[PDB]
Amino acid sequence: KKYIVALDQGTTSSRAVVMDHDANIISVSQREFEQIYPKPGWVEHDPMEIWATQSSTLVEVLAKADISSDQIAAIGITNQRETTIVWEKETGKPIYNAIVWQCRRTAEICEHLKRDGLEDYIRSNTGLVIDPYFSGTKVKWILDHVEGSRERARRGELLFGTVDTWLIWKMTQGRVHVTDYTNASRTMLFNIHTLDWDDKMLEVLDIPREMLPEVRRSSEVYGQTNIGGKGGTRIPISGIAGDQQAALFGQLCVKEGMAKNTYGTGCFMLMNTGEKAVKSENGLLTTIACGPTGEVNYALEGAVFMAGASIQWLRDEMKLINDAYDSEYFATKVQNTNGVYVVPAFTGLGAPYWDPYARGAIFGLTRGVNANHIIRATLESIAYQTRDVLEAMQADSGIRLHALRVDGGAVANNFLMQFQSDILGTRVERPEVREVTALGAAYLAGLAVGFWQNLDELQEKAVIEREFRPGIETTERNYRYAGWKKAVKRAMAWEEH
Amino acid sequence: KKYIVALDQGTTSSRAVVMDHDANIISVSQREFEQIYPKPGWVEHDPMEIWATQSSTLVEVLAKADISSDQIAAIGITNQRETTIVWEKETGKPIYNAIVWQCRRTAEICEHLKRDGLEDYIRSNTGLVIDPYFSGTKVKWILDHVEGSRERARRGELLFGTVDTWLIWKMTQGRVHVTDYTNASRTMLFNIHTLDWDDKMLEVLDIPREMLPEVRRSSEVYGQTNIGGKGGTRIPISGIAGDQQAALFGQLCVKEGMAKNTYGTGCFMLMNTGEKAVKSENGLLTTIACGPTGEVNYALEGAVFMAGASIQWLRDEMKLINDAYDSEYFATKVQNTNGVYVVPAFTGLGAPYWDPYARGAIFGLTRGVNANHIIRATLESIAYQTRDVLEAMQADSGIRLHALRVDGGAVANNFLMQFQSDILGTRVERPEVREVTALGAAYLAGLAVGFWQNLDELQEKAVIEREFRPGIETTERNYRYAGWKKAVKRAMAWEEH
């Protein structure tokens, strides 16, 4: 039993990683799944596709590396954080598509909450802001949408779950229905204090206690999978965290004050707040993180819905680039957006604007503006956003980040990185590997099964490939922000209710 | 002497046309020139390039068709309407680049005017709105900008001119410095009532009477060119109108109530207002047009800076299409902008917004929005804009257009056309040839020299290739406008003063 295996269920792709005692990545496997947009502002996913893509990779990784089930010390699970799922207990057949995190359909409802005045309750018990972002709404919506539901849900013939959940469920064959705290913290049906399903909540959204799973800790054994190979040979499942949290962990930010920014589908900057929860005064999120070994901790989170995803759209949608010619490629061909600004409200906004009507937009178009400027402009949106939240965190946190700890594909983008640094007017530290996410789950489940005893051992696995120090001055720096901001406003409240 | 030749000096290209008594286009020639953008919101042109491209084509056309100077009954001149030029009398060497019409540099000044309260004077004597659009400002700017200027301009060692002017000047070798009324009407230094250089004006912008040319009528002989060929064989020059007006003419809109919309670099919808001038209550322009034979008339004009130019940018800038694959091609591949809106404030706005800070922008971006939607979205911007002005004209004019008379390349775009119709909720009539512009000058100069006696003869040259009748209903129609509008606002006052 020499390997930990991590299931990394992205927003965009299912991943699988093999890592050794040395916490090395032995092998990886990636499967993309369809981004479903039933309609503008909507985003779905096929549970099956998820499942399928994730199971398959899981196999592939082993496959490829001659590794046999029986060397799999255990399995860690990390996932895309809010997308909701509902399916028939008996069958396990979804009553409906996955309603992913970015999907803005709830919105309305959110207004009702708004209107009924739970701002506070919610915020004060969930740490959450009112948004279409979170599971609660989703669930409901489903229920509502799908006829018999509630009633059947009442007889819990119907089940609820986030991705970690669903996965597991499937890996165990119904055997186990569970989530972990990190995940649970985002449903907006779960008290992050009490640490239980929030009655009032369920009450409100009117969700059967019956469909929710057992919340558990991020590292622990929740069960096991049979994936053939040697007969009656099973694999323990013992790690579970929100991709975002999974990262902070892999990042070894197990101590309050430690923060990171993940450059993925969205930007996700989290700060450990130790064992203490932190109210956000700057429309930030307050949630559940991992203790130095997956215990309960807290964090401050800055959620930016549109980040690599951005990049991905210039590619697959705008078709303005390829896997051949990088965003960086071009971006660097010009020396500026030419005044251009991109506002990736592709999904509405969020931290800290938390608009759900704000929509994607370009500004400051000139006769001579080209792709490149566009490209770049895009690329910069990221840094921008980041800044926002960043700044915000300080506020809330009360801590100046002196350098930035980053992770996620995007971070490979030297340009971006630089800019980020400039723009921040802060060094930015780019590590050896961006899999921190997977690491985390690795770590986690690994820990949970002794594979490792503690982050200690691997305090030194962490390598700073590069650091970027600002090269722009306040003035300037403070200037561009200006437009960015200018722009930003222009995008909001776009969509019609 | 069997042919009239038209010099069509576009915003984007220099053209040349040969037409026979039958008013047929015998041959054409086109040369593109560089679009100069010294900086965002700026647009220049090289006088020489202009000149060069125009002279050369002029030759080419003849060349190509075995036509000899001596069959050229005469020459008509039509041009891009506001761009300003200033050059050394002696040398004819510009003291500075052409400051084309769209260039927003004046702006400021315009504010001063604003501030000093001439809204009215200006409007009431020039028919003009206060804008960076018009020559006045430009001139000044130059002067100011260029050291000795004023003083040298005072000794008129320095000359002023719009394109028709400059051309001529050159064709005659200094011999003649003249403009026509249409052109003059746009300087915003010229009384469209009095029909003279407006003292107050010059006063204001502080422009030496000394540099302005003699204003004359659109059809008349102002002189002649030597372009080799048979010895001492000259060609009379006898037609002069603003491309826009040149079109209305070619359009045979010599009678009040007659209007058209030109689908060119910009959209330009004009309405004949006969011998009577018309105040605009909906921020429209009041200007000089042609009488049934180039006499003075008036019109109502709707100026839309960004039209084909738009299309041209997706091509050369965005590179999102080609001469191979049409905007139409794609546009039609989707069924809607997907909610997207393009605001071609690439040059600020104008009729009727007359913003000069409004800048290019895209809105309503979604994860699934693609090129196409973009493309289209672009394409539709046109129709939109049009609508605006259209509606506005009625207001002012007090006349419902029952079908739309159109011209300019774009009009070939069935899509666009349809949309236009739908959107308008009005039939749109697309003629046989879009050269109406050139026609006009043809006509003009031809008339001026008897070649023809009057539009009468060619009342029947005009062929309706196609008509587009709406297929969208109010509701809908009135809906999309809504966003378009929504959008539109979001673009304004973008640029920083």
How many Cβ atoms sit within 10 Å of the Cβ of residue A194? 10
| Greatest pairwise CA separation for chain A in angstroms | 68
User: How far apart are alpha carbons A11 and A180 in whole angstroms?
Assistant: 18
How many Cβ atoms sit within 10 Å of the Cβ of residue A107? 18
Which residues of A80-114 form beta strands (DSSP E)? 84-88, 94-99
Asked if B218 and B78 count as a contact pair (C-beta separation under 8 A), the reply is: no
Give yes or no for B493 touching A (CB within 8 A): no
Same domain, B204 and B296: no
Q: Is residue B453 classed exposed, middle or buried when 0-12, 13-18 and 19+ CB atoms within 10 A define those classes?
A: exposed
Query: Residue B248 has which token pair?
Result: 């209305």
Query: Residue B253 has which token pair?
Result: 């809109």
- A327: Cβ contacts below 8 Å, ≥ 6 apart: A311, A314, A315, A321, A375, A378, A379, A413
Q: Do A363 and B367 touch (CB under 8 A)?
A: no
Domain C-terminal end among A251, A280, A300? A251
Query: Residue A246 has which token pair?
Result: 């999974």
Q: Where are the alpha helices (DSSP H) in A133-230?
A: 135-145, 149-154, 163-172, 181-184, 199-201
Give yes or no for B491 touching A (CB within 8 A): yes
Sign of CA dihedral A433, A439, A443, A449: negative
User: How far apart are alpha carbons A38 and A347 in whole angstroms?
Assistant: 13
User: How far apart are alpha carbons B76 and B247 in whole angstroms?
Assistant: 13
Give yes or no for A493 touching B (CB within 8 A): no
Query: Residue B366 has which token pair?
Result: 């979604």
User: How far apart are alpha carbons B376 and B373 in whole angstroms?
Assistant: 5
User: Strand B25-32 relative to strand B214-216: parallel, antiparallel, unpaired?
Assistant: unpaired
DSSP annotation of A82 reads S
Residues from chain A contacting residue B345 (CB–CB below 8 Å) = 365
- Report the domain count for chain A: 2
Q: Which residues pair with B269 in a beta bridge?
A: B261, B302
Same domain, A360 and A216: no
Angle at CA of residue B78, ends B72 and B82, nearest 5°: 155
**Candidate from A309, A339, A370 with C-beta closest to B318:** A370
Listed residue (A316, A317, A294) closest to A242, CA to CA: A294
Q: Which residues pair with B14 in a beta bridge?
A: B9, B31
Phi-psi group of B182: left, alpha or beta (phi > 0 → left; psi -120 to 50 → alpha; rest → beta) = alpha
Give yes or no for A361 touching B (CB within 8 A): yes
Phi then psi for residue A100, to 5 deg, are -70, 165
Residue B267 has, within 13 A of its CA and on its CB side, a CA count of 34
- B11: Cβ contacts below 8 Å, ≥ 6 apart: B80, B83, B100, B101, B102, B264, B265, B266, B309
Asked if A363 and B361 count as a contact pair (C-beta separation under 8 A), the reply is: yes
Give yes or no for B41 touching A (CB within 8 A): yes
A477-482 contacts: CB < 8 A, separation 24 or more? A477/A422, A477/A423, A477/A425, A480/A380, A480/A423, A481/A384, A481/A387, A481/A423
Q: Do A365 and B347 touch (CB under 8 A)?
A: no
- Nearest chain B residue to A358 by CA: give it: B364
Q: B7: domain CATH number?
A: 3.30.420.40
Asked if A404 and A418 count as a contact pair (C-beta separation under 8 A), the reply is: no
Cite the annotated binding site of B for sn-glycerol 3-phosphate by residue number. Answer: 11, 81-82, 133, 243
Listed residue (A15, A198, A165, A37) closest to A103, CA to CA: A37
Cα B178 to Cα A459, B241, B381, distances in angstroms: 83, 12, 37
Cα A148 to Cα A115, A422, A488, B219, distances in angstroms: 28, 55, 42, 81
Q: How many helices (H) and strands (E) does chain A have?
A: 15, 21
Across the beta sheet with A403-407, the strand order is: A285-290, A296-304, A267-272, A259-263, A403-407, A427-431, A464-468
Listed residue (A358, A414, A412) closest to A385, CA to CA: A358
How many Cβ atoms sit within 10 Å of the Cβ of residue A333? 13
Query: Residue A204 has which token pair?
Result: 């409100």
> Collapsing DSSP states into helix, strand and coil, what is residue A84?
strand
Query: Residue A158 has which token pair?
Result: 């119907």
Same domain, A214 and A119: yes
Phi then psi for residue B428, to 5 deg, are -135, 125
Whether residue A312 is annotated as binding a ligand: the answer is: yes
DSSP string, A413-441: -HHHHHHHHHHHTSEEEEES-STHHHHHH
Q: Could you tell me the end-to-end alpha-carbon distance of chain B, in angstroms, rounded to an integer? A: 55
DSSP annotation of A35 reads -
Same domain, B172 and B26: yes
Same domain, A2 and A88: yes
> Collapsing DSSP states into helix, strand and coil, what is residue A245?
helix
User: How far apart are alpha carbons B51 and A359 in whole angstroms?
Assistant: 46
Q: Do A359 and B370 touch (CB under 8 A)?
A: no
3-class SS shares of chain A: helix, strand, coil, % to 5? 35, 25, 40
Angle between the B163-172 and B47-64 helix axes, to the nearest 10 degrees?
A: 60
Phi-psi group of A79: left, alpha or beta (phi > 0 → left; psi -120 to 50 → alpha; rest → beta) = beta
Beta carbon pairs, A and B, within 8 Å = 118
User: How far apart are alpha carbons B401 and A6 in whole angstroms?
Assistant: 68
**Candidate from A41, A320, A369 with C-beta closest to B366:** A41
Same domain, B192 and B61: yes
Query: Residue B428 has which token pair?
Result: 């749109």
Same domain, B235 and B266: no
User: Strand B72-79 relative to strand B3-9: parallel, antiparallel, unpaired?
Assistant: parallel
Cα B12 to Cα A54, A185, B8, B45, B264, distances in angstroms: 55, 60, 11, 9, 10
> Collapsing DSSP states into helix, strand and coil, what is residue A287?
strand
How many Cβ atoms sit within 10 Å of the Cβ of residue B200? 13
Same domain, A291 and A390: yes
Domain C-terminal end among A251, A277, A298? A251
Angle between the B108-116 and B119-126 helix axes, to the nearest 10 degrees?
A: 100
| Helix or strand (DSSP H, E) at A300 | strand A296-304
Asked if B364 and B483 count as a contact pair (C-beta separation under 8 A), the reply is: yes
| Backbone break loci in chain B, preceding residues, C–N > 2.5 A | none
User: Strand B13-20 relative to strand A72-79: parallel, antiparallel, unpaired?
Assistant: unpaired
Listed residue (A392, A397, A362) closest to A378, CA to CA: A362
User: How far apart are alpha carbons B431 and B434 in whole angstroms?
Assistant: 7
Q: Do B365 and A346 touch (CB under 8 A)?
A: yes
Whether residue A376 is annotated as binding a ligand: the answer is: no
Q: Do A362 and B365 touch (CB under 8 A)?
A: yes
Asked if B356 and B366 count as a contact pair (C-beta separation under 8 A), the reply is: no
Same domain, A202 and A191: yes
Cite the annotated binding site of B by residue number. Answer: 11-13, 15, 81-82, 133, 232, 234, 243-244, 265, 308, 312, 409, 413, 476
Asked if A460 and A22 count as a contact pair (C-beta separation under 8 A), the reply is: no
Listed residue (A104, A221, A242, A129) closest to A172, CA to CA: A221
Q: Where are the alpha helices (DSSP H) in A262-402?
A: 308-316, 327-331, 371-397
Question: Which of A340, A362, A365 best probes binding to B when mutated, by most B CB atoms within 10 angstroms?
Answer: A365
Query: Residue A59 has which token pair?
Result: 């196999």
DSSP annotation of A157 reads S
User: Smallest CA–CA separation between B27 and chain A, in Å?
Assistant: 31
| Greatest pairwise CA separation for chain B in angstroms | 68
Asked if A496 and A358 count as a contact pair (C-beta separation under 8 A), the reply is: no
Domain C-terminal end among A216, A251, A286? A251
Q: Is residue B210 classed exposed, middle or buried when 0-12, 13-18 and 19+ CB atoms within 10 A define those classes?
A: middle
Residues from chain A contacting residue B367 (CB–CB below 8 Å) = 35, 37, 43, 102, 309, 313, 317, 346-347
Identify residue B82 by its one-letter amino acid code.
E
DSSP annotation of A14 reads E
Asked if B255 and B291 count as a contact pair (C-beta separation under 8 A), the reply is: no
Angle between the B371-397 and B414-424 helix axes, to the nearest 10 degrees?
A: 50
Q: Find where tokens 């007659």 sit.
A: B258
Q: Which residues pair with A290 in a beta bridge?
A: A296
Q: Do B371 and A319 touch (CB under 8 A)?
A: yes
**Candidate from A35, A368, A486 with C-beta closest to B37:** A368
Listed residue (B32, B28, B27) closest to B10, CA to CA: B32
Query: Residue A212 has which token pair?
Result: 């929710």
Phi then psi for residue B69, to 5 deg, are -35, -55
Residue A259 has, within 13 A of its CA and on its CB side, a CA count of 29
Q: Do B317 and A361 touch (CB under 8 A)?
A: no
User: How far apart are alpha carbons B166 and B172 in whole angstroms?
Assistant: 10
Identify residue A286 by its one-letter amino acid code.
T
Phi then psi for residue B86, to 5 deg, are -140, 120
User: Smallest CA–CA separation between A311 and chain B, in Å?
Assistant: 11
| Helix or strand (DSSP H, E) at A447 | helix A436-447
Q: Is residue A484 classed exposed, middle or buried when 0-12, 13-18 and 19+ CB atoms within 10 A define those classes?
A: buried
Same domain, A327 and A464: yes
Phi-psi group of A109: left, alpha or beta (phi > 0 → left; psi -120 to 50 → alpha; rest → beta) = alpha
Q: Do B37 and A367 touch (CB under 8 A)?
A: yes
Same domain, B404 and B343: yes
Give yes or no for B336 touching A (CB within 8 A): no
Listed residue (A40, A39, A41, A49) closest to A85, CA to CA: A49
User: How far apart are alpha carbons A381 and A130 in whole angstroms?
Assistant: 24
How many Cβ atoms sit within 10 Å of the Cβ of residue B292? 17
Asked if B18 and B27 count as a contact pair (C-beta separation under 8 A), the reply is: yes
Cite the annotated binding site of B for glycerol by residue number. Answer: 81-82, 133, 243-244
Query: Residue B254 has which token pair?
Result: 């010599």
For residue B132, is the peptide bond before it cis, meaning its omega torsion is within 30 degrees of 0? no
Rg, chain B, Cα only: 21
User: Smallest CA–CA separation between B31 and chain A, in Å?
Assistant: 20
User: Residue A16 sits in which domain range?
Assistant: 1-251
User: How far apart are alpha carbons B179 and B169 in whole angstroms?
Assistant: 10
Same domain, A66 and A210: yes
**Candidate from B102, B360, B364 with C-beta closest to A369:** B360
Q: SS in 3 state form for chain B? A: CCEEEEEEECCCEEEEEEEECCCCEEEEEEEECCCECCCCCCCEECHHHHHHHHHHHHHHHHHHCCCCHHHEEEEEEEECCCCEEEEECCCCCEEEEEECCCCCCCCHHHHHHHHHCCHHHHHHHHCCCCCCCCHHHHHHHHHHHCCCHHHHHHCCCEEEECHHHHHHHHHHCCCCCEEEHHHHCCCCCECCCCCCECHHHHHHHHCCHHHCCEEECCEEEEEEECCCCCCCCCEEEEEEEEHHHHHHHHCCCCCCCCEEEEECCCEEEEEECCCCCCCCCCCCEEEEEECCCCCEEEEEEEEECCCHHHHHHHHHCCCCCCCCCCHHHHHCCCCCCCCCEEECCECECECCCCCCCCCEEEEEECCCCCHHHHHHHHHHHHHHHHHHHHHHHHHHHCCCCCEEEEECHHHHCHHHHHHHHHHHCCEEEEECCCCHHHHHHHHHHHHCCCCCCCCCCCCCCCCEEEEECCCCCHHHHHHHHHHHHHHHHHHCCCCCC
Query: Residue B281 has which token pair?
Result: 């209550």
User: Strand A285-290 relative to strand A296-304: parallel, antiparallel, unpaired?
Assistant: antiparallel
What is the distance of C-alpha A222 from the center of its chain?
22
Q: Do A364 and B365 touch (CB under 8 A)?
A: no
- B75: Cβ contacts below 8 Å, ≥ 6 apart: B4, B5, B6, B7, B171, B225, B235, B236, B237, B238, B239, B445
Asked if A224 and A172 count as a contact pair (C-beta separation under 8 A), the reply is: yes
